[PDB]
Structure formats: C-alpha cells, structure tokens
Amino acid sequence: MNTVPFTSAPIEVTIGIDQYSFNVKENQPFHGIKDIPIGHVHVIHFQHADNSSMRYGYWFDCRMGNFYIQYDPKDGLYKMMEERDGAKFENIVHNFKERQMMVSYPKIDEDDTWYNLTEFVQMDKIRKIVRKDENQFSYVDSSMTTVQENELSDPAHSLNYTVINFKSREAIRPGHEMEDFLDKSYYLNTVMLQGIFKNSSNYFGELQFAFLNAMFFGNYGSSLQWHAMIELICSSATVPKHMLDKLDEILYYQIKTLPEQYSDILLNERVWNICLYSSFQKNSLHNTEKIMENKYPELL
C-alpha cells in the first residue's frame, strides 16, 4: 500500500482519487491519501470550490517514485511533485499517519472496478500521449486539446493520441476505396494494430485512457478519441475473437461507471447506435448492449 501526502490544503477543493472523491474545506487539516493499491496506475484530481471551471489532475504509478501534492499560490493549483529523499518522505508519511490526518483509499474487497477500467493502461504509454519528460507523472485538465484537434494550438500542452481519420489516405488503400471505407478491417488490423500500436493491449490502453480523461476531466477531445477507437473496431468485419470479447468487457465497465447525469454529453448517439445496431459487430457486444439498453435507453 502506497501514500500520496499533501503539504496542506489551503483552498477548498473537491479531490478525486480514481473513481472516489471527497470534499476538503479551506485550511482543513488534510494531509493526503493512504492505502493506495499498488499495481495499477492512478489519477488524483481536483475541482476548486470557487471555480468549478478546469477540472485537472495527475496520472501516476507509485512504483515509479514517491509523489506528493503541494498547493502553489502563484499558479493557483495543487501540484504533484516527486520527493527524491526516500527517508525524508517515509518520515513525513509516518508522522501524518500517526496523527491520522489522511483519508484511506476506500476500496471494497469485492470491487474490481478500477482494475477493469485500467486493465491495459500503462504509465509509459500515458507519458507518450502527455509529453513532459522531466516528471514521472502526467498532468491533464479539461481544456487540453488533442493533436488532431490542433490540426483542424500549443503543442507542449496537447494530448498526443493516435490520429484516426476514416477519410484519410492512411485509412483507404488506392483501388479499395469502397471496400476500405465500408469495412475498416485493413485500417484496424494492418495500419493501426500491426503498424502503429503493435498489439491490441496498447490499442485498448489508449482507448481506456481516453475514456478516463473524458469522464474525469470532461476533456472533449478525449471523448472524440474514445468513440473513434470504438467505431474503428465496430466498423471492421474482421476482428480477432479475443479482441471483441475484451472490448465488450471494457465498454461494459465504462458504461457502468459513467455518471448517469453525464450521459447526455459523454455519449455520442450516432456511434453507439451504429455500433450496437448497424455495424458488423452489432451482435458481438452482448454485455455492453444489455447495460446500455437498461441504463440509457433514451440514447437509443
């Protein structure tokens, strides 16, 4: 079990840790989060009480270093930092635990939700999408645009998701125009899987990361990326059986976790109706179709 201590909490803020969240009052004696499961990436995120504008946060993996949070009054946000002095860090954490000034990561034993949402997500791939090589953790916020959004402006602050574009020369073989547009298997299997992602685990990792940034930060370009990666699979007649089975599980847990009240903005009617009812894979996503129909029948 690992710990992310806080120097202090000078401004009133709602703090998220993965799918959990709690409110901290202005100058409340809060000194961090303990008992964080090792073996998974995590995200610690923030919404100030006075400016619900800009949700922001940090992806991290406690195996990669000792990280803490400290409010910066100049830049006006809670910043993640790495502590390189291991003994200073352990002494800080032990003091804060003794004084019981930390919240406990509140995982139910039965509960595999976070695993199921992050199964293929790896910190090393996160750090290639979010480029800031001097830190071991990655900042994301509501306003960051994607490389593809920038093509249609600050590149250092961009989400470098893999560009997917169904009407592109990358996606369409000369002479197979109709074939490749109507059946995207070539683009999925040769261009993206064999060529760019190398395997389906990396593809699923990026899909999962895009969903999580859409859900936790309302990041619009991340939602576009998530739906594009779903649509590319669903619009392919030829998909490995193991990928379809895994995709069904992935989407099931994403739809299960989505706040009911955010479905109007986070779910694209066209993609979902196409994927569940028109596409080649309309009959291949049984778990996802069943939860979508019972939880969001309006969308459909």
């Binding site: 009407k167 592109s168 020369r169 369409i172 125009e177 109709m178 547009f181």
Partner: protein
C-alpha cells in the same frame, strides 16, 4: 458549403466547376418471373457530369456488364460514379481540372470525397437545388447513345448547342433547367412543344432545335405553362 438560391451566380464565375448527377447510373426494369416472383433487369445507364459555365457534358456510359456478379447495386452505383468522376479528373490537364464538384444527391458526398483524397484542394459540395438532371435521358440523342452502347464509353456533348454565341451562361443554364424540368414533369407534352413545327430542325451536331431568339421566347413560355399546368393537374388548382 451547400449550393442554394443564395449563391446561384457562383455557377457562372471563372472557377472551373462540375455538377455530377448519378440518378441514371443504375437503371432497371422490374418484372415478374415464371414462378411469379419479382426480378430486376438492368439497362444501360450514364453519369451526367456537366460544366454549367461552358455547357461541356462528359457523359460516361455505364454498361450493364459492370453490374454482373455484384451485390448491393444501388450502393455500388454511387462508388462506381465516384470512381469514374475521379478518373475523369485525373485524365484532364491540371489547368482543366475543376476547383469544385457539386453533387446533386447528398449520398454521393462520401463516395466522391474518398475517391478524391488525392485532390485535397478540390471542394466536394452538396446543393439544396432540386435540379432536373434526371431528365437527361429524355433528350433523344443522349438516350440513343446510352441504349446502343455495347461497352463502357465516354461521349462528349455541348448541352447548350451554340447558345453561348448569343446568350450568357446564366441564361443558357436557366433555359436548360426549364427544358429539363418540363421534360421531367410531362415528357410527352414537352417533346410535342419542342418538335411541333417541322420546319425547325435539330442540327446533326446539336441536341435541341435551331430556334431563333423569338422562337425560344415562345418555346420557353410554353414550357412554363406546361409546368404550372401539370402543377394544377397534379394538385388540382
């Protein structure tokens, strides 16, 4: 964006553009089988690709052999149309290639866009106009060359004959669309109007009769009457 009443004069500026109409590409007769089921028999078709400024019509004849062994022919027809338009563009010298292609049906947008990815600077546009180019096969000489074709063939016609010697391309297009609208609403009546007087002939190298300026005014008035009429005979007014 989309082409409508607001931006109508743009058709006659000096940026090369082509209309593409695919309504006559896949054509069938529907008939009964010996068992009393229904079946289709394809007949020859054509892509109608027209420069509205010059009158230049690139009539790509679609021979029924192109459909042999193929499924979902109405879908294929849109992609075949886009393949042939793309081939036409690539065949033209750079300075003759269009800067815009306007499709008369929105279902042609994605097929043509995908086929023209190599030409990012050619704009593919829909239109809100209800243009009567489906009536092209009511023009006797065009119907004749399509139905006689025994293989794929491109034929060139000036759809304005020599009218641009005497009128502008705005006025020529307006006459063309009036004639075609008439032929679409009541083909028999329209053709009666055009050929009633045996002394006005169609030149061998023309599609329409050799009307004087005065006779065109009479003709155009008779076509307007027809279109309003049928619009009464239809709606009872």
């Amino acid at each position: 964006g989309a082409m409508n009443s607001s931006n109508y004069a743009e058709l006659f500026n000096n940026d090369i553009k082509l209309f593409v109409d695919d309504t006559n590409v896949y054509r069938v007769t529907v008939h009964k089988t010996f068992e009393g089921n229904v079946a289709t028999k394809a007949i020859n078709g054509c892509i109608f690709t027209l420069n509205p400024k010059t009158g230049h019509l690139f009539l790509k004849i679609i021979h029924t052999s192109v459909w042999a062994g193929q499924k979902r022919l109405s879908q294929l027809a849109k992609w075949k149309t886009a393949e042939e338009v793309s081939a036409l563009v690539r065949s033209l010298p750079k300075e003759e290639q269009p800067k815009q292609i306007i499709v008369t049906r929105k279902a042609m947008l994605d097929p043509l866009e995908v086929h023209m990815l190599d030409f990012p600077n050619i704009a593919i546009r829909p239109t809100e106009l209800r243009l009567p180019f489906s009536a092209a096969m009511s023009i006797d000489k065009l119907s004749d060359v399509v139905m006689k074709a025994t293989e794929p063939q491109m034929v060139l016609f000036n759809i304005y004959d020599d009218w641009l010697d005497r009128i502008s391309s705005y006025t020529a297009f307006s006459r063309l669309t009036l004639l075609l609208r008439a032929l679409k609403t009541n083909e028999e009546s329209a053709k009666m109007i055009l050929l009633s007087d045996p002394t006005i002939t169609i030149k061998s190298y023309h599609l329409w009769p050799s009307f004087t300026d005065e006779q065109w005014i009479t003709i155009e008035s008779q076509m307007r009457d027809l279109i309003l009429t049928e619009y009464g005979r239809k709606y009872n007014v």
